[PDB]
Amino acid sequence: GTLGRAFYSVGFWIRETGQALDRLGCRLQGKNYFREQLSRHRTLMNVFDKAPIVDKEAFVAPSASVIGDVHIGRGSSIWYGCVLRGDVNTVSVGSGTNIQDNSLVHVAKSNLSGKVHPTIIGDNVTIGHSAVLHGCTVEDETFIGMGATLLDGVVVEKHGMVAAGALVRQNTRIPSGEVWGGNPARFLRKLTDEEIAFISQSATNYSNLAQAHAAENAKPLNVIEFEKVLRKK
């Protein structure tokens, strides 16, 4: 709360002073390594006491951005280039759910247009590449087409499908077993059983793929690349 925020602010003053002192000490020794422009990107970023809570069996790509109060469950996966920003409200991701590359899952930045809705992503959900989820609920075992946009208030009922490139307008409800698509999103047809099987099997295949990518990313950083970057001329 307020007292925690005051201690966080005063803490930053002590840290600023200490880091300045370290830079002084390095300057007296004739070192300029602190001037190097290194990336300050954090895979998990806190905004005061709103931090992400990520399950140990969840793959998160290092270049992904998870900011604020974000919950990722077991067996879930946040792929390369994704951004999840729950600060004004919360963002929760169920288990076994894949958020594909360059997807954006965020909440409204301001309450000017009313109260800010949280974003709820259910279980065994597939979110396609470069999809935009904005304060919407996406129930279990649903399919969000790649390049699609879901606006605040939207509900995608279980076994719902949003077609690739679709624009689901604000407060639209997508019923179960329906395929909606286009701009604005409109009912196209019903979901077949083969496609339901594909939904579940695709969520399972991506959990196995996430595991493989997590092992290759956790491999220790190669020293030879470091020495090559260091000794360049």
Partner 1 sequence: PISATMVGALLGLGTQMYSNALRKLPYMRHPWEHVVGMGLGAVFANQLVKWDVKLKEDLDVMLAKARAANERRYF
Partner 2 sequence: MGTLGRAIYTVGNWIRGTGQALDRVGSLLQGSHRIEEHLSRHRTLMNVFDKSPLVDKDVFVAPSASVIGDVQIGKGSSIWYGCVLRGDVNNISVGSGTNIQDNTLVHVAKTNISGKVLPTLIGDNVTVGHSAVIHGCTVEDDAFVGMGATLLDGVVVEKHAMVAAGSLVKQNTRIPSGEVWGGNPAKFMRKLTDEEIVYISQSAKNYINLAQIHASENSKSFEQIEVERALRKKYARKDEDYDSMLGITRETPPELILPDNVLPG
Partner 3 sequence: KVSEDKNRNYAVVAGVVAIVGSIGWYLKA
Tell me, residue by residue from 208 to 227, as one string, x for binding to partner 2 by CB under 8 A and - for no binding. -x--xx--xx---x------
β-strand pairing of 59-60 with 44-45: unpaired
Read off the amino acid at residue 160: G
| 134 touches 148 (CB < 8 A) | no
Tokens of 109: 């930045």
Contacts of 191 by beta carbon, 8 Å cutoff, 6+ apart: 159, 160, 161, 177, 178, 179
Smallest gap from residue 166 Cβ to partner 2 (A): 8
Q: Which does 62 bind (CB under 5 to 8 A by kind): partner 3, partner 1, partner 2, none?
A: partner 2
Tell me, residue by residue from 8 to 27, as one string, x for binding to partner 1 by CB under 8 A and - for no binding. -x---x--xx--x-------
**Of the candidates 2, 3, 13, 28, which one interacts with partner 3 according to CB under 8 A?**
28
Using CB under 8 A, which residues numbered 91 to 120 contact partner 2? 100-102
Query: Of the ranges 23-31, 62-70, 77-85, 126-134, which one interacts with partner 3 (CB under 8 A)?
Result: 23-31
Binding site annotation covers 74? Answer: no
Q: Which does 102 bind (CB under 5 to 8 A by kind): partner 2, partner 1, partner 3, none?
A: partner 2
Give 13 or 33: the residue with its C-beta nearer to partner 3. 33
Tokens of 211: 């595991």
Distances in whole angstroms, Cα of residue 57 to Cα of each of 73, 74, 211, 214: 8, 5, 8, 9
163-166-168 Cα angle (round to 5): 110
**Of the candidates 155, 164, 191, 196, which one interacts with partner 2 according to CB under 8 A?**
164
Count of residues in contact with partner 3, rule CB under 8 A: 3
Q: Is 216 exposed, middle or buried (0-12, 13-18, 19+ CB in 10 A)?
A: exposed
Known binding-site positions for Zn(2+): 106, 129, 134
